[PDB]
Each structure stands twice: as C-alpha cells, then as structure tokens.
Amino acid sequence: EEHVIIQAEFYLNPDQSGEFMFDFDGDEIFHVDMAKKETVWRLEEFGRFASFEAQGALANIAVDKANLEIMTKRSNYTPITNVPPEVTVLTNSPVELREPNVLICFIDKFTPPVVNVTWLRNGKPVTTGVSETVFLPREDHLFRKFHYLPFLPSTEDVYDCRVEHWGLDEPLLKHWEFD
Amino acid sequence: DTRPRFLEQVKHECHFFNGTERVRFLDRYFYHQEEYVRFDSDVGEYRAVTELGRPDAEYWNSQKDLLEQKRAAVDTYCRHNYGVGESFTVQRRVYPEVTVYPAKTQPLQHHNLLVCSVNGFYPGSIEVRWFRNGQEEKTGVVSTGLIQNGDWTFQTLVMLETVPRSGEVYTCQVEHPSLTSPLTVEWRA
Amino acid sequence: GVYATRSSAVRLR
Numbered sequence: 152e153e154h155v156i157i158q159a160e161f162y163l164n165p166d167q168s169g170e171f172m173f174d175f176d177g178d179e180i181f182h183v184d185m186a187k188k189e190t191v192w193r194l195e196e197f198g199r200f201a202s203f204e205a206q207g208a209l210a211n212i213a214v215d216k217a218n219l220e221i222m223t224k225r226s227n228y229t230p231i232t233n234v235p236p237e238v239t240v241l242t243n244s245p246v247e248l249r250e251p252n253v254l255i256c257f258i259d260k261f262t263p264p265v266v267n268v269t270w271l272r273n274g275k276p277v278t279t280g281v282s283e284t285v286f287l288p289r290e291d292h293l294f295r296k297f298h299y300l301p302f303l304p305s306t307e308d309v310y311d312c313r314v315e316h317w318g319l320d321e322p323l324l325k326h327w328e329f330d
Numbered sequence: 331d332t333r334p335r336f337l338e339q340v341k342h343e344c345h346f347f348n349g350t351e352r353v354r355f356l357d358r359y360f361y362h363q364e365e366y367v368r369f370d371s372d373v374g375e376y377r378a379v380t381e382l383g384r385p386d387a388e389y390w391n392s393q394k395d396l397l398e399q400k401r402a403a404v405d406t407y408c409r410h411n412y413g414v415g416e417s418f419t420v421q422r423r424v425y426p427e428v429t430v431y432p433a434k435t436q437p438l439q440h441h442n443l444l445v446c447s448v449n450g451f452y453p454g455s456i457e458v459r460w461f462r463n464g465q466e467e468k469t470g471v472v473s474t475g476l477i478q479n480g481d482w483t484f485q486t487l488v489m490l491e492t493v494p495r496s497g498e499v500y501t502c503q504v505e506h507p508s509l510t511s512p513l514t515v516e517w518r519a
Numbered sequence: 520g521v522y523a524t525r526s527s528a529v530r531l532r
C-alpha cells in the first residue's frame with residue numbers, strides 16, 4: 152500500500168476520557184479538543200487547506216462511551232492489563248553550544264492512554280515553552296506520545312524526562328546531557 | 331489510583347494503492363487491545379474477530395442501511411478524505427539537512443566513529459550510504475534507524491566505524507523523494 | 520475541502 156488514513160478514537164473508564172484523531176502514514180493530521188469542541192490541526196498550515204466539523208467527533212465519542220459500557224459488561228468486567236512505556240530522549244538536530252534546539256521525549260508502546268510527564272532541568276520541573284501531542288495510535292493498538300522542550304544547550308545543564316504510568320513501579324527517568 | 335480501567339477503541343482505516351485506483355476500508359472495533367469485530371470492504375459485511383464480537387457482527391449485519399453506509403465508505407469517506415488532504419500529506423516533501431561529525435565509540439579513545447546526521451525530512455523513505463575515497467563502505471555501519479519526530483519530520487543517524495587516516499575523504503550520500511539527485515556531504519581528516 | 524467522519528456503530532442493549 153502507498154498510504155493509510157486512520158480515524159482513531161478511544162474512550163476510557165473510569166477516567167471518562169475520550170479522544171478523536173486522524174492519522175496519515177503514522178503522523179497526526181488533527182485531533183478534536185473535546186472540552187473546547189474544536190479542531191486542532193497538528194500543523195497550522197493544514198487548517199488553511201481543510202476544515203473539520205468537530206461536532207461529529209463528539210457524536211462518535213458518545214457512541215464509544217455507550218459501547219464501552221456494553222462491552223465491559225459482556226466481558227464480565229475484565230479490566231485492561233497495564234503495559235508500561237518505553238521512553239527515549241533525543242534532540243531534533245545535532246547539538247551545538249548556545250544554538251537553539253529542542254529536546255524530544257518519546258513515550259511509546261504503552262496502555263492505557265494515561266501518563267504524567269515532567270521535564271526536569273537540573274532536577275527541577277520546567278514548563279516554559281513545553282508542548283505535547285495527544286495519544287497516538289499504534290498498529291499493535293498500544294499508544295505513543297511526544298513531549299517537547301525548546302532549550303539552549305549548555306555544559307551547565309542536565310535534563311530528564313520523567314514518565315509516570317500505572318504499569319511502572321516507579322517513575323521512569325531518561326537523561327540527556329551535552330556531549 | 332489502582333482502580334481497574336476499561337478501554338474502547340475504534341479505528342476507521344482507509345488503505346490506498348496506486349493513488350485512489352485501489353482502496354480498502356476497514357471499520358475496526360477494539361476492547362483494550364483486542365480487536366473483536368470488523369467491517370472489511372473486501373467482504374462487505376461485519377465479521378467477528380473474537381468470540382466477544384459475535385453479537386455485534388450479527389446485529390450490525392441485520393441493518394441494511396448501516397451496511398450500505400459502510401460499503402460506500404471507500405468512495406464517500408476514503409477517496410473523499412484523500413482528496414481533501416492530498417496537497418499537504420501525499421504531496422508533502424521536505425529535503426533533509428545533512429551534517430557529518432566525528433564521534434567516539436568509547437569516551438577515552440581517539441575518534442573512531444563518523445556520524446552522518448540526517449534531519450528534518452519527509453516522508454520517511456530514505457537511503458543513506460557511506461563512501462571512503464569514492465568507494466562505498468558497507469562494513470561497520472550502524473544506525474539509529476528511522477526516527478519519527480512527531481511533527482511531520484523524520485531523522486536518522488548513520489554511523490561508520492572507521493579509523494580516519496590523513497588524506498582520506500569520506501562522503502555521506504543521501505537519497506530521498508524530495509531530492510532530484512543524491513545529496514552528498516564530505517568529511518576530511 | 521471538509522474531512523468526512525466515518526461513524527461508529529452502536530451496539531445492541
């Protein structure tokens with residue numbers, strides 16, 4: 152095949168979390184902010200060329216919620232087995248001292264789609280300029296996710312991405328430092 | 331929070347072969363990680379994937395209006411959406427930036443690793459090769475593999491284990507759909 | 520253009 156487009160949805164109990172997104176060849180086209188009832192394009196340029204009626208996502212999620220109840224009952228209330236994530240930290244380009252770069256925390260191969268992620272600089276939580284993706288679908292029906300931290304590389308700073316997930320006994324820290 | 335979780339997933343998939351000449355639609359339903367029922371456009375009806383999905387297969391297949399909705403999806407859904415997004419997805423092309431720098435296999439030792447860093451490209455299909463004085467070097471090559479950045483760009487590091495000698499010229503060569511001829515970067519010791 | 524939504528089928532009971 153040349154290309155695959157997937158409309159991927161989930162609903163999770165008891166968290167009452169529901170997601171709706173479109174994937175093209177493994178990349179996110181957009182997702183719907185369920186709380187704001189808005190379409191969020193992964194690249195802003197996408198929204199100049201296309202539109203999406205966010206309301207349709209809401210309708211689907213409502214069906215998924217109702218469907219989950221039925222299925223949960225049908226399965227005799229068999230719950231999900233936690234699968235803890237693999238975490239990788241990398242930069243998006245080769246690192247040069249005082250040349251603006253971006254740290255990427257890749258959280259992969261996990262379920263259920265619930266995680267706490269924190270960027271640490273020298274052991275301290277940082278939130279300035281951070282961003283993140285929604286939960287992205289895998290072909291094995293687990294999930295992956297990206298977190299980002301723009302930074303100015305220096306010999307004086309170390310970084311960690313800290314990931315909490317119910318499948319982990321303790322938080323997972325993946326380290327990055329210069330050279 | 332140790333409370334048990336329950337997850338429902340749905341994936342509506344459109345698979346394209348040769349543009350929109352051949353198209354397959356899959357309506358897939360999941361409980362946790364378990365696909366339990368699916369509509370395959372190759373079949374034209376729902377089929378249970380596991381025992382869990384049999385009631386749904388039977389109920390949904392009894393609804394002619396629903397089935398006709400699903401049977402038309404390759405046109406009204408798959409081909410339609412392909413058309414909508416084609417200019418910025420199918421046709422998306424960004425060359426790679428290529429940098430070569432020396433590295434170490436072990437911290438204490440002299441430089442014995444040449445890194446070809448290939449960054450920011452799309453799509454993922456790429457071929458990276460190493461050359462020493464115009465001859466391809468196929469031994470001692472290790473890579474990160476293809477890395478998705480999550481932002482519609484990829485990267486990969488392709489490393490050559492070698493002990494550089496004075497005069498030698500190494501070349502990293504990159505081929506990619508965004509390029510019309512190979513992109514080369516030289517490194518001299 | 521406008522992206523179309525495939526709908527999700529409602530199960531019985």
Ligand SMILES: *[C@@H]1O[C@H](CO)[C@@H](O)[C@H](O)[C@H]1NC(C)=O
Nearest residue numbers: 224225226227228229381382
């Ligand atoms: C749920 O319980 C019913 C009654 O015993 C049984 O027929 C069915 O197989 C059970 N399903 C599972 C997967 O446990």
Ligand SMILES: *[C@@H]1O[C@H](CO)[C@@H](O)[C@H](O)[C@H]1NC(C)=O
Nearest residue numbers: 265266267314315316317331
């Ligand atoms: C995230 O953090 C909160 C409290 O810090 C906790 O209640 C919740 O269970 C955490 N989620 C995960 C997946 O660890």
Ligand SMILES: *[C@@H]1O[C@H](CO)[C@@H](O)[C@H](O)[C@H]1NC(C)=O
Nearest residue numbers: 153346347348349350351352
């Ligand atoms: C692909 O589609 C074109 C028509 O658009 C056709 O001419 C060609 O033979 C098809 N088959 C291939 C490339 O396998």
